[PDB]
């Protein structure tokens, strides 16, 4: 095959032939705003690039066909990116999120590999034939690190260096090349970071860098050129092309720079998801983020229990494990202003209220199969009855508690009052009751009523100013609320007895609650904190994550025991009720209706 040079500049990726007279021609791409890093897969005839402005990493054939954005979420400054041509994996480094991530070349099974004690990684280079991974860091103390291509065995390789760029591996001669942007030099070392040599010390402004055969190539922002020199002496210098201002990255598109082999190239290591190379030339099987590797070291299992917390324009997920895996943002599209979230553990789908679109939407954690349940209206809070498959939500515009099936079919209104202001809400269908804050003017209340609207009881009417969040734990028989004005979080029994203040200090704006098992999580929007307290009392109050802007809600998800779920008498086709299925104190069921219907003589159906 023929070798040619690709370079990025402005919103264009262009091609320069090294055999022919330099015929600068652009690759017919579309939708590119600011192309930066570049890589390729010669066996696929595909090119890969990152877009710093659009915060994406994309792929396309050399003819421009099959243009795909394989990474669209969770990016800030994707400066480093590299293609694992053996295991068919995509690596990238984000200077903003301070993360080294991996995924398939099509974007599936995205996983975080390095995230702890990582300050601004810039360039990234891969050596999958050996199983090593090299990157530069522009952190507090710039250096060049190394680790296995599964994220393990992280170490400092070159500590004594400035902010390096264009990290390139000479696979034939076992040397690392980089451009020190602080000292304006082109340097080289061996694979161990020793035997440092200065290749070119008289260049005005080198930036991009790549290596091919006996030559190194670089871009010079001062001479506005792409130049070439002997990779050893730095001599025999030549200009490949001039009048090219601010070229970001360069590479030689040729099969001689993607050689070698490993077990991932032959059988994907029989891994179900990710086949990650490790020294020396071996492999290990990897899983998507928050997935766990089974005992066979091949297959991956999805997380069964986790925490969800939402921001204004994002919905995130978090687990509790030993290695302390990082939180991820779920690829949910078109999030504008998320106010509250919920989760159906049966069909494993995510629900949320978007206050700007003023609707209740639904999708999986994949982001696929999006569907709007409710569409003026102003949904405020929501709570899912997972047994009767209904959503109990409050409408800030009409001041009612409205019930809707998961598929969008309306059940009806179960609560409405002249001066009622129902806001926060949580459903307890194991006992047949619901709890909601009633923010009446200068008289806020926390009330309880049956799931059909009857048996209204004010549980609390004093010591409140702006009760804004609610949580409930049915096994403990406990209700939890958080007052944003009084700046405290309280607890009480479901009956209303034993009201106690859990925390009332160092709390600015609590706007969400959830219970895991023995822990009570909450979010402080003003402090940008997610904290938790131990309810059994053994451990103390701890922070779990900080610097989270525009927090809106938090929701814990517990693995569903299906046989205990089927034992709930409303799980078997609503217990014969055409609308509201009510559990009564004896364990049996009763049927009821929304307020625009009446129960008929058959004690099962509701008619107008």
């Amino acid at each position, epitope marked *: 095959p023929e070798a040619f040079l690709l370079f990025s*500049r402005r919103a264009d990726i262009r091609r320069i032939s090294l055999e022919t007279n330099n015929n600068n021609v652009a690759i017919p791409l579309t939708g590119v705003k600011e192309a930066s890093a570049l890589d390729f897969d010669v066996t696929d005839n595909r090119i890969y690039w990152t877009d*710093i*402005s659009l915060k994406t990493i994309s792929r396309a054939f050399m003819n421009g066909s099959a243009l795909e954005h394989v990474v669209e979420f969770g990016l800030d400054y994707p400066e480093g990116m590299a293609v694992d041509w053996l295991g068919k994996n995509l690596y990238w480094a984000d200077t903003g999120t301070n993360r080294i991530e991996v995924s398939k070349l099509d974007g599936q099974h995205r996983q975080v590999l390095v995230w702890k004690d990582l300050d601004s990684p810039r360039a990234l280079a891969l050596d999958p034939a050996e199983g090593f991974m090299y990157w530069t860091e522009w952190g507090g103390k710039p250096k060049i690190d190394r680790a296995a291509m599964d994220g393990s065995e992280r170490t400092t390789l070159v500590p004594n260096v400035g902010r390096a760029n264009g990290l390139t591996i000479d696979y034939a001669k076992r040397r690392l090349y980089w451009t020190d*942007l602080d000292t304006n030099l082109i340097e080289s070392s061996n694979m161990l970071g020793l035997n440092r040599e200065v290749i070119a010390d008289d260049l005005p402004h080198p930036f991009g860098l790549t290596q091919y055969q006996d030559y190194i190539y670089w871009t010079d922002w001062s001479r506005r050129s792409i130049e070439r020199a002997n990779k050893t002496s730095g001599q025999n210098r030549t200009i490949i092309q001039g009048h090219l*201002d601010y070229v970001m990255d360069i590479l030689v598109f040729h099969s001689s720079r993607q050689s070698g082999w490993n077990e991932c190239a032959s059988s994907n290591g029989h891994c179900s998801h990710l086949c990650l190379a490790v020294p020396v030339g071996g492999f290990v099987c990897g899983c998507p983020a928050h997935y766990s590797l089974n005992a066979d070291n091949r297959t991956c299992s999805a997380p069964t229990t986790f925490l969800l917390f939402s921001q204004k324009s994002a919905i995130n997920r978090m687990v509790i494990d030993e290695q302390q895996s990082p939180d991820i943002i779920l690829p949910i599209h078109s999030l504008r202003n998320v106010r509250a979230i919920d989760y159906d553990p049966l069909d494993k789908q995510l629900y949320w209220i978007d206050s700007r679109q003023n609707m209740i939407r639904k999708a999986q954690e994949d982001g696929s199969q999006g569907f709007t349940v409710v569409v003026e209206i102003q949904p405020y809070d929501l709570s899912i009855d997972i047994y009767s498959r209904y959503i109990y939500w409050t409408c800030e515009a009409t001041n009612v508690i409205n019930v809707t099936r998961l598929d969008g079919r309306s059940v009806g209104v179960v609560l409405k009052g002249e001066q009622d202001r129902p806001r926060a809400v949580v459903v307890n269908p194991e006992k047949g009751y619901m709890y909601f804050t009633n923010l009446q003017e200068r008289s806020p209340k926390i009330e309880r009523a049956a799931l059909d609207g009857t048996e209204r009881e004010v549980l609390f009417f004093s010591g409140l100013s702006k009760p804004i969040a609610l949580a409930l734990d049915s096994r403990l028989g406990k209700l939890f609320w958080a007052d944003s004005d009084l700046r405290r979080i309280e607890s009480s029994d479901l009956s209303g007895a034993n009201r106690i203040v859990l925390e009332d200090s160092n709390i600015l704006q609590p706007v969400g609650l959830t219970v895991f098992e023995n822990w009570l999580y909450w979010i402080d929007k003003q402090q940008q904190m997610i904290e938790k307290i131990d309810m059994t009392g053994r451990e103390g109050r701890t922070k779990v994550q900080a610097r989270i802007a525009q927090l809106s809600d938090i929701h814990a998800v517990k693995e569903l025991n299906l046989q205990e779920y089927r034992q709930h008498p409303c799980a078997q086709d609503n217990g014969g009720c055409s609308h509201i299925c009510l559990v009564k104190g004896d364990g049996t069921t009763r049927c009821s209706c929304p307020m625009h219907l009446v129960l008929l003589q058959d004690e099962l159906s509701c008619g107008a």
Partner: nanobody, 123 residues
Framework: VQLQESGGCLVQAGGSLRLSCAASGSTFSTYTIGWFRQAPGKEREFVAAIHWDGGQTYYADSVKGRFTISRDNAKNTVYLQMNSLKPEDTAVYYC??????????????????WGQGTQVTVS
């Protein structure tokens, strides 16, 4: 982040003038500050850019040798020293900032913050 230019006024041909760009809401240690100018009936033109951390400077050919961009060690302020002013230097000079260090500084679309601009007229 907010930016406020100042220093523009009427000035003679061959005279000098220094513009300044006051900045707020950051330490700007991760920012690039650039100067642009736009004359009536013309496209916006890149003038100069500087790394707040690093000191690397970049200039357009039309202002080389005549214009110098510099950084204040005290008051979060970037200066544009303009010597040997031609009549063609007449434009509204804008101050731009972006939280990224190495990129195409002439690419005005990718900057994140802009000021109100200040008018420089050269007779």
């Amino acid at each position: 982040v907010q930016l406020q230019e100042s220093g523009g006024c009427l000035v003679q041909a061959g005279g000098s003038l220094r513009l300044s760009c006051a900045a707020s809401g950051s330490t700007f240690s991760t920012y690039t500050i650039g100067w642009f100018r736009q004359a009536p009936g013309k496209e916006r033109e890149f003038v100069a850019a500087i790394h707040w951390d690093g000191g690397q400077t970049y200039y357009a050919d039309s202002v080389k040798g005549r214009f110098t961009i510099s950084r204040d060690n005290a008051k979060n302020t970037v200066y544009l020293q303009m010597n040997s002013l031609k009549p063609e230097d007449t434009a509204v000079y804008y101050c731009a900032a972006r939280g990224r260090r190495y990129f195409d500084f002439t690419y005005s679309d990718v900057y994140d913050y802009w000021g109100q601009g200040t008018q420089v007229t050269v007779s």
